[PDB]
Structures are given as C-alpha cells and as structure tokens.
Ligand binder design. Sequence first.
Ligand SMILES: COc1ccc(Cl)c(-c2nnc3c(C)nc4ccc(C(=O)NCC(C)C)cc4n23)c1
Ligand SMILES: [Mg+2]
Ligand SMILES: [Zn+2]
Length: 342
Amino acid sequence: SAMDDEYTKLLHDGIQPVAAIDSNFASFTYTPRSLPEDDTSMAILSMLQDMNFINNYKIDCPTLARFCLMVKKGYRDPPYHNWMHAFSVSHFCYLLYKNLELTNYLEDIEIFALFISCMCHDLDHRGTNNSFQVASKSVLAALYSSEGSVMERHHFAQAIAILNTHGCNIFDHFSRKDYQRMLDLMRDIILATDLAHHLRIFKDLQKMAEVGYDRNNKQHHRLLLCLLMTSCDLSDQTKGWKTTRKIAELIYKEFFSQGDLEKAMGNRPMEMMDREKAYIPELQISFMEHIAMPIYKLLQDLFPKAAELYERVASNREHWTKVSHKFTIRGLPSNNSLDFLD
Ligand SMILES: COc1ccc(Cl)c(-c2nnc3c(C)nc4ccc(C(=O)NCC(C)C)cc4n23)c1
Ligand SMILES: [Mg+2]
Ligand SMILES: [Zn+2]
C-alpha cells in the first residue's frame, strides 16, 4: 500500500520546521507551487503546527496524518483543479495568518476552519463547472442541482466523507458545540468558493469595507471569511508573471477540454470554453479587472499590509496587455508554412 508507507513516515518521522521547507516560506513572494508535490503533505503538517492548531485543538497526530493524506488523495488530476491547487490555496491561507493579524478579526476556530476548508474546497473536482453538471445530467447534478453550487456542495460532502472515514476525523474529540460549529463553518466557506456566491455578496463586502470591520458583528465575520477564502482561491494571481502565465495555460486546458465535451453533446460552449473562439489575453485581462483585482482591492481596504497583493495583481494584468500582441501571427508561423490555412 502506497498510502500506508507514506502515512507511516508522515506520522513517525516528525514535522519539519516551516523554515526548513523554504527560508521564505512565510512570505507573500514565495510560490508554493515550487514545492515538490511529494513534500506537500509534510508542508501541510508544518503549517498546521506553526499556526498552533495542532496544540490548541489537541489534534491527534495519527488521525491528522491520515486526514491530510486522505485529502490529498481526494483530488483527481485535471490540469488545474488538482491537489497542487488545493495545496497552494492552503499555503496562501497560511500566508494571511502569518502576515495579516487575523486574530484581530476572527475567532480561533474560524481561522482553523478557513485553513481546513482551503485544503478541502475543490475535493474530487472533475475539471468541469457547475453548468456542465446539469447539462451532462451528472450524478452530482441529480443530488444538488435544486440547491445550486453543485460542485461546491460535492466538495463539502467529500470533506465530510473523509471526516466520517474511520481514523480520519480530526475533530472527533471536539465538544458537540465546537464540532457543529466547525462543520457549519466548512459548509459556509466551501460554498463561498462558488464565484456566483461571491458576485451575490460583493455589494455586502464593499459596504463592510466602507463602514469598517466590526469584530462584534457576526455577519462581518461571515463576510470576511468568504472574502479571505476567495483571496486564497485566486492567489496564483498575486505571484509573478510566470505563475499567472502557467496557471492561465492550466485553466484554459481544463476549460477547452470541457468545451470539447460540450460540442460533442451538441451544445455550444461559453466563448471562454471554446478553443475556436476563446481569445485568452482578453479573457484573462477581463477576469483580472472584473474579478481578481476587486477582491484584492477589498482585501487591501481591510488589511493595509495586503496592498502589495493588489499591486502585483494589477502588475500582472498590465503584463497581459503587453504580451497580447504575441497572439497575432506576424510574418510566417513557426515552420515557414501556410498549411494551417487549409
Ligand atoms: C473561485 O472559483 C473559481 C472556479 C474556477 C476557476 Cl477556473 C476559478 C479561477 N481561478 N483562476 C482563474 C483565472 C485565472 N481565470 C478564470 C477565468 C474565468 C473563470 C470562471 O469560472 N468564469 C466564469 C464566471 C466568472 C462567469 C475562472 C477563472 N479562474 C475560480
Ligand atoms: Mg471550486
Ligand atoms: Zn479552487
């Protein structure tokens, strides 16, 4: 058994200090996708230890090791929505913890729930979106289409199934109230990763940042968790140009594959899913200006120390404008041939 030996080492070898992973591991400039995939489960444990969650919540180490491996094994391998995405999203949550004084805003258990939700938030993603579940009449749509956020409901359900697997419930010593609270938080945070949900609550996020965060307002806690979750989910946009470029390639590979499946079903894909129509520079610039930048602007509004994140998203978007011309074939192609016109 592969997992058996990995677990044995994860449990008995001990947890490496975060600085041994990388000297800049806790910096906004660090790219967690640089970490070898084989080192990521150990890194998850290192972060959990460094954030004091293991000690504070007296988490059972064998259970935690099993849980971490089960979560990793709970991702498939589409180009983008894979374990390295969940890992990098979890890492950014850790960065927010290390850089932004979250304990002035959120309860301990909320910060814990955010991180665990990050690990779990895309579990068993098949590389297709919510619309496709309904159009393809998938099992997931049969279960959840009446509620909406089909994939995100599945991700949450998958997280619960892992918890309900013997030897994996890292919360099973919790008081009844804390257990209920944790699972309720995971529901809210994972369901908040549906961009439709973000767009619905965006006005509320703005009003929150306008009036100023009120740590005594429970709805403010809820809203901030949603924003932070979204900030983690999109955090590839806050690194360098190379990260944005590669993640664009991964996402559109995933998108265009869905589009191919939609065409074969006799449906016409969204433009951004259609490899014959999608003009990537326009599409990325649009996503950055209309989705990613406003999120990190709000984050900056609430946390001044997060200004560098917004400025690098803006910087990355500007670089897309600058390379857009490259999508136009000047002169002859690659191979000196016009055969592709046929
Ligand atoms: C947070 O939940 C998700 C779920 C899935 C994805 Cl792929 C993303 C996500 N993460 N990075 C990206 C980038 C770089 N570009 C994207 C361009 C479009 C869309 C998309 O789904 N647009 C449809 C809607 C806006 C009408 C998502 C994009 N995205 C986030
Ligand atoms: Mg998702
Ligand atoms: Zn995600």
